[PDB]
């Protein structure tokens, strides 16, 4: 591809990550209260660079869809996956969020781009995978989304 166009695409991904950070706040609020993980959430209007930022109310997974100013339709999403430790004391695993299950404490987030087929979160271990694989090519994404 074009080095310059690849730079322009990369330079625009942060606007979607910023909208995703607002969505992460909604998920964290609702996780603590046991409510729909998109509770109170207002999905942002489409912009030049970000077509949508959506929350799955059951899992809290966030899908960021970029416009063609970043990448072609169908190869344009990042997925942010939330999780919590299985135990408050000396956990052995991470568990997904689930609507209706109060989840206290710190929520971990993991970003996925295309090609990242396994979680690499640190001990106590892997978090959940995207319900639907991310489709934005890894070359456009931050390092933490590539693997």
Automatic annotation (TrEMBL):
One GO cellular component term of this record is:
pilus
Which GO biological process entries does UniProt record here?
Answer: cell adhesion
What are the alphabetically sorted keywords of the record? Membrane, Methylation, Transmembrane, Transmembrane helix
Q: Does the keyword Membrane apply?
A: yes
Q: Which family does it belong to?
A: Belongs to the N-Me-Phe pilin family.
User: This protein is called what?
Assistant: Type IV pilin protein
Q: What is the lineage of its organism?
A: Bacteria, Pseudomonadati, Pseudomonadota, Betaproteobacteria, Burkholderiales
Full-sequence range covered: 54 to 198 of 198
